[model samples]
Target chain A: PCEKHSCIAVIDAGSTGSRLHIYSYDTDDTNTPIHIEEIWNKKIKPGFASIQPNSVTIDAYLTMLLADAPIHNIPVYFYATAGMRLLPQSQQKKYYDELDYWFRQQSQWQLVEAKTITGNDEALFDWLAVNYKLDTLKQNKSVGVMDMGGASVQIVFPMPKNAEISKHNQVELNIYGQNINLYVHSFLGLGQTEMSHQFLNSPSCFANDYPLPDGESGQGNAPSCKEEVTSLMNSVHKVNQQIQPLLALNPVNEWYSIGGISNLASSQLFHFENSELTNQSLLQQGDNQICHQQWDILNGQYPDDEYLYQYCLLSSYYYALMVDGYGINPNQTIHYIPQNLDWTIGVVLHR
Target chain B: NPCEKHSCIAVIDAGSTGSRLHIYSYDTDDTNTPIHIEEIWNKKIKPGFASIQPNSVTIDAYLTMLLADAPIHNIPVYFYATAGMRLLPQSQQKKYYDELDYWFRQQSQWQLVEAKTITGNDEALFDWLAVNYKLDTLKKSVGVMDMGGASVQIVFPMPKNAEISKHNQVELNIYGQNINLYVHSFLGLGQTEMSHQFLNSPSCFANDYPLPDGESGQGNAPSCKEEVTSLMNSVHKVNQQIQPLLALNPVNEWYSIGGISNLASSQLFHFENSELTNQSLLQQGDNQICHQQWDILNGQYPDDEYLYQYCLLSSYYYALMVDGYGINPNQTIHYIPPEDWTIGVVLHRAL
Candidate 1:
């Protein structure tokens, strides 16, 4: 074990919510890689400062991230997405000034310049996270990296070194982002409220799914909201189909998600949510008509597992982010090494 | 009107490009009907020509009409879609012989040296044929009067009076050809060789169209050939939103070979031994608008003026066969009673 040293804090302010990550470097040789552990996190209500209540909700969330994981005064990194970018002019300025002031006072961590990742850069980050360092991972391999959030979806296509020669062999990565050219143009209209609205008003928008008339589940007559969750979870070709040929010159074989939606629940991250949710809304007394009438309330609730799954999965991947030595310090850089991994996760800074 | 009583014959020939519906009534009341007026006709290529052609292989189109006008062969009728029905090679030869020996022989009366009608009571003939028709008519509203020659396409759907709730909606009439009852499948592919052969066989299929990829066309890309004819005229809602509602209801507005590529020429009728065609071939000259063309040439041609109009389209619509009869025979038998047809020019039924 190396000697203990000063701790550094890193914060991620995204389109959906804000997360605080704390990292501690090992002393002694100092040349050796430092250890990273997720020290804090808080999921505020979706949307940034556009809604006043959203701002307050973020403030409360920040308070929790700081309180849950104690940290000393350290410099911090901040980034914003669609919500912040789309906020009204006055509201965005107000929130930026307010966040800067509060962040300085609460943790004494002065803000480094805030940088917004472009659609292309976001794709590169997702690609880097999924593919790791291309220079190190010389083997022709790839994995899809998706971040399905509330308002947007971003896609990251990471190709293998020699993908030009192969067919059906792809290095595809898909992330969901608002109006981005990564995932697919048709996928852009699948926003939550917009999806529901199109589903209700003009069911034809969802016609490609078949038999799903107005008000029915688009994934073929599925009776639960988990079906929608599963639909979002199944991103097999999302990364490969849309991003690979355009962004990645290499064919990708692997795929995975690294965002709030994927990190919401423990065990829930691997499979799908539809198999887990259940209900007895239609069952009633058969021939006896509820023998001896008695009032009862079944406490079985359809939990907000979708939200939890994404949140926890995102948290897990964020931890993977630190494992690579990014989002914390400037000196320590993680190079991607080629190796066969059954299932592994990590992140890299957008280059 | 002729003093010695005129004679006329209506001949319908269904081909791959489109359907020819003829309504030629001679001014010989003593022989057959008295009106030599070449009515109206319109054209609509079912959208299966380009997109669905690859998958469904053929597109079945339905042509319905109301023939209540006594001056002509006034009878309600329907034509089945033949893009992919019975023309499966072996079966196609049989249908070809049937038309040549039976159907075509009856139609050959127009080319005979004598001006007369076949001996038979018209209504009794309908009853006899109604009881002896060969094709299946289950779930079919209107009796199908024709089948496709190039690719076997059968048509069966609701009668002209049947209510249309949706495109995929079902109203079984004669037990066959019901658009809603039967599967409307398409391969979305056509005979690439045949299409190329019509265009004089270029090196690539793109030669048939003005491809933006290669150095095929320098400046003289023909505008008419470049346009997407079938999808050219569509009713787009806000933001180019297409409904396809009529399509989903299982109700076909009209039966047609959605690709309006004319391959008929009187010049080819005599050149049976050689495959020489009169249509302009794709020329590579920069000043010449003709590059490579794409189309399917049917083996036969129409003999009647009405059917000729159905097969051939000019700049004007009223002179066409589909529009002549007024009401869509495939949809209704109401005669589409013309309130008043304004005379724009002297209409002549082409010989």
Candidate 2:
């Protein structure tokens, strides 16, 4: 400690990508609480698992950041999301062993073994971060969190005592000296990427620039595509019936964004009198219109954007799942943020 | 000579508010089309058939007076007791039904075809039959919407693809024609009961109600539509009185001034049921009229400000049509006058 300060590092090792954040906090000699500040952060793609049971790639990224600082003395935490969770147990063990071996050999910085995160864990972390930012921990009321990741989606919210939630999905946690009961469930195969496959009836849709199979190649029929995805979301409803007022976290990929309505300019967030979040016109620059718009983009003389077609299909699927499957009112507002949220802050605070 | 040219039927409608007898005489034309010869009507007495249970002599006297000059040598007589009788104890219902049966049987000239307290479902289907037969469209599929004091009924021809609940399906044989009908009666969703719930709901008078001092009454405040929606969604249960702290406006007493008026707008009467029926059922578009009717009935505004009676009636009609009978708002419905069930009974007997 520099007498009144300390620092720590948290690495969010997700499936498709990994990001490192260095946080500094004041540990003053008073009752004043420690305030965490993000000193610096950076991200790289293809994830830790893609590196093939090796730590060299992560080491390279870490060394460059630690070159001029006291990073060696700080505690470093590596938390993995769906990407690593999808790996085989044997490969995961090999990956962890090699990662540990490399960090031990360096003997320069404190490195904790990477922890595999469950979807529910990610949901809890997101809920903590959102409520913490809104300063609603002590206010008795907490907003819900809906995180759409690559392989799955997480829904976490504070459930009232009378709410009929499944026992498996109900998480009881003691936070800020208050007993909080949360209703949390992670739906697999309903993620944007996975649903696109179901919507187009082909894994080929995964390729951003790839054309649809010959017979199906044309402008996307949004209504029909929506119906297809809606059939999938209906199964998730068996886990939890009520899904409304979900404060959607940063969307994992594709065209994931939201914006405030013109009429709601005065309010921080558009308040729905009696509506679900999915119904809001919060999409930044895409909707069913984009499904048709993408065809025009594909027909342009110049080369098309890498993921333009994928984004269009996905955006339509998202609308169908949320509005039709989840019964989200069209007037609901989605609080959209351009950048990724700092979920590590939530994990760090929990300690 | 008159008996050879015409036939007659009698229907005694004992409702919650009053009792009425309607005698309709029908004559056949060369085309075999039934023509309404004449209608002799008599209205008297208050609610509660129990008041005249032991006074069969008085009841017989009333019926004799109402018969006036109608041909009653072999006509059928139907004494159907509605909400008031249905709500009575089993013993009371049987007592009243037996009294009416005895009183009518004493008149050897007239046939006591049906004498009992009819259920909401029975009343609803009868009403549908009544309206459709009057339009000479009884052979065509038709839907009926009826709102009584304590309940609402929706009766319609069952759709080909409808997955109707066993409890809601009613089979009727009218004129030797077998018909599968969808009939549902929602108890406590009637105009009278809904008005009571609306007047006492915090959403109607809580913090939003305009007061004499230009300040709102200090109570729980939910928007007008929100309150109406809640009432529509919830089962009618007796709730607590308006908060004592609430300085309600005198006009807020719906029971005194009467409920919604007869404003006819098809667009305002539509809503969606996420639980019971996932489809959007709309009878009207300007839903605000219904809300405003509640406001007017709750004394938030004067009775004349909105179509108080019509607004409540339309909304009540919608609830019966959608929730009770599962009839889509897009479906065509006919609102024939009361006592249409008599036509259905007479036509079926003739068949």
Candidate 3:
């Protein structure tokens, strides 16, 4: 039931929801260069059950996902992020144990357990796959990057540019505009999807009469979530502490970058009259009634539409171009067309 | 002529901005709570300016604010937050020293130097106020509270049958939510006027990021305004961490009770029907937009003549009703009326 052929399937487990992306790619010429076409984007709520994915829950979700593609027989690499990481330490262990147990029983052929990932690593890899353009950009400049997921926030601010440290492998990141030597961090906890992930019912931490965690609190047993959050922010506060003073002392003529769902939400909330399919009109007036997930995801989805993929590509490409200060198009290196190839084996070639 | 009937103003400075609240009490009822009327809110760019009496920047901003009610001389009593003590350590002493020197030369008023009257005293005074409730419904173990201005958000939770702790007092906070004991903390260099506040220019920080005195290097320097903002949401993450645990623990029915701005913006991006509205069409959909301001203000200001004043009255009423808990609807304290006071003095009281 399996074949040894090169194939690719985009599995995006996004916040607010998840999707199984099946991209059928085709090469125009092996003699010349390759041209790729992203054929299909079949999406569903695979991530709905992600908030509490135990063995039974994961199995149920996996079965539900297979309704679209008999993905069990295919080479499927599961990708998870902040939401998955925020699962209680015990729950996470149980989830993997159950996942391994269930997969052994479900499929005909022998298979290895799926690889797990931290939210930070997932965020980094996603950025690399979607936005890695390295040709003309300078190394050693720190970059600030942020990825807002359903349950958590992954943030990275590049460290100082030490020339001696440049000999090692490095990566580029962009956040809140300016480019710098990359130092990144992940505030790994449930954000909007906190209760769902942890099966908790409310936000923790409080003092005086405020309903949040904002001030300094000494360590006490059962300290509210507010106290813990304040503690965490104080710990990570140094990251910002490091980036800003440098800007004052140095003053680089570059844009600093910051990323969050708020920006995306703002863009989608406003509409541009002149632009047919852009986020301008929604944000023009700057008056958006805050709603739950429904408000965020409703407008972005279109049947037989690759709008999101295009946006993702554009977001990645725009950053690359801006950082590199040049025009560059991402070329499709390995194209997989559905008609000519099998979807079983993953391709690992040494370039 | 202005001897027996001297006009004095009350200035309330919250975490974010500073406000000059002018409550005219008949030049008689020094003890009776005065009726509040028109409240004009001026966004504070830098909160530190409030402490400066008559500096160039302070004079300029103050004159601009009072210009609407010009030629008015009132002795103002300033109220600063007790929590601001935390910021003293983080802030540079040079800035305050320079501010004090510059302020003296401009206004010739030694308000800072005199240091005669502050609206409230230190922690002990605040604790005493908690012990003496203006209304008695607050005597029991109830919900929550918050006090917020431009930037800082403080939260408090109530324990079951919880008696008042002389050390950590419980008072009705202005900015709080009751759904959960969530202490939302957002520490930044500035307030809502985030665009205007500057800790350091990004480029300058990058170029000359030096360590604070006694710190190791520039990398250890304090975070700029932007960096604080970037890291501000850690509180939200912390809330999720304990939401489930709390939900399992609290079996009692809960309700929300807090004081915050509730008026919907005149500009509408999202409508009651969930359609987005813009400036050009905003007027047409004005009837449908829900009032999203504070409680008491939203309640009282919706007559044929006073739509704008509704936000103020509803917020105040919301706070009063919450602390009193439906016990006191007496006609004397039913609602603070504008007819009891003069126009100039009453208007400032409302804010």
Candidate 4:
């Protein structure tokens, strides 16, 4: 049922959720060059990373999410980022084998081999997505891209002049008739979830009101939490001096919640209004108070709440990772990418 | 000794207002990097290709006029038409481009490397290359802004979370280094074209003629200023939607070029309104300026006859550059010569 049009679907099998993105290009018009437009963007919870590797279950999730789409004509590029990358090798193979089996049996869908991408892979795709969306690739100056997911973190940037690109971290691509050299690195076990697990080894950073099944709690000290997270991120990944104005895909919601929706915070979170980062202490403001409240609400109520109870610890870890872990200033700006678009578009472009 | 290795090259920047000819020579640095030795000569002619029909006749005349200053030996000459030519009907644009090509061939003294109408992307890339080459920041991150008669252009490294379009991103290989950039041009938002819209509107006191004495003209009123401010607000909205990168802080220097910034009353032109000119009244912020800008928007205040038009033009520039682009008001912006890609291409070819 292959069609004549240049339509493609991309699947982002993320840790938190699996997203399906369908984009079709209008290339028939001679006046304008080919341009791809989004037709559908949808997602399902309990990402493949956390689910069991079973074809029947995976097919149900896929079929229910896709509904009655005639996807046989459109090729689907499926790529998994941090979530799958952090899985054990056996788990990764299991997940991928089942994915391959499920797609092969369908016969109704055009599918490529399922890939378990590295952190660098995620970052590269992010770079492509951001550049593709902004149309910056043609401008001769590339922007830096960063993504902090649930289990890993990635950074991709223009290599600074005279700075040596470690052989292991260099990335090169031939795109749009131009050669692109970039420095990219992905840190595993450094995502929000993983970092929280490392920091929460002690209960001292949790809210006293946190309703633990075992009834364990603490005062949740802010400075201590920051120090521990900062040390951990720094020990694992070396920060690059030239990094600034990082385009980050993960949301910094804890700070947004504290800033009370001021244009300054939202502007920093959404629009990157002020390029210079705000004072580091802004990240420390009532850190303990907000942490306690968030944890209390998360523990006493909905276990399915999207915003986790460990947000305070995670926020501190996020800030610490950027400033202390990566050698950037709190005064430097970080732009948040919309969760829906980045990786999904990236994998499709990659194919 | 350096003169022996230097060669003269010419590039024509054909814009809406006029076409300028830049004759410059380049010499290789110790590292083989091309350095601009000096500008041997420069000249501009009126009635751009748009206003003149059977445009070949005018182009032929201009090429003939520049022939006397051209190098006696074979050297590259590039003719690049910007917004002015791009705005013309397709058939007319083709005729002008073809005529220029033919005329260049007729001239035996100079080599026609490239002669054609360039898209906004082409224009921005050339300007970016020229500035980066001049500053020796080609490998480092830099940003460039160009506000011309019919459009405004921005070129720089992609900022975090900036929106991108397929047509706006460009990739280039320069100095053996690959560069990815974010470049965009907003049409109908140039200094001259935007002013025309404002001046043509009844809200801008379209019927009022200039007073010879430059006194408080009957047209000076709050209603007019409010309308102009609202118009500016709408303009800002469109820019924010189309080009979100403007919301990011511009490069440290924010290099600016073109006739608009070179005028006596640049973006600060509107501050010359009698009462507003007083330092006492000028610092009150947008509310005060909203009503006060009427003096300049209308023909009421005229330090220069062209001043009135520039006032309106500069106000829009401020909106686009300072307000829309989020550039600092106090930063010193450099205004340089209009760049032509022919010279940039010539330098690149030297490698």
Docking class of 3: incorrect
Better of 1 and 4 by lDDT: 4
Q: Could you give candidate 1's fraction of true interface contacts? A: 0.00
- Tens digits of per-residue lDDT for model 4 on B1-351? 323568667777777866777777777666566676477767876656565545666668766775565444476677777776654434456677787778877767778777777766667777788777777776535777787776667888764333555556777667676677777665555665444323322222222332211112233223344333443344234345434554453355567766543552343333332112112212322232333444344334333335334333434555565555655556545556543444555565554
Which 10 successive residues of model 2 chain B have the least lDDT summed? B249-258
Winning candidate number (DockQ): 3
User: Distance from true position, residue A42, model 2, in Å?
Assistant: 1.9
User: Which model is ahead, 2 or 3, in terms of DockQ?
Assistant: 3
DockQ of each: 0.01, 0.01, 0.03, 0.00
lDDT of 3 by residue, A39-130 (tens): 33455553532434456566776556544564334444555444444332334555567656766776532332343455445435433322
In model 3, state the lDDT of residue A275.
18
Model 4 residue A309 lDDT score: 46
Weakest 10 consecutive residues of candidate 3 chain B by summed lDDT: B211-220
- Which stretches in model 1 have alpha-carbon errors above 4 Å? A1-3, A26-33, A53-68, A85-91, A104-107, A127-144, A157-249, A260-351, B1-351
lDDT of each: 0.28, 0.50, 0.31, 0.55
Give candidate 4 misplaced runs (Cα > 4 Å). Answer: A1-5, A26-34, A67-72, A139-142, A160-168, A201-204, A211-216, A236-282, A285-289, A292-308, A338-340, B1-351
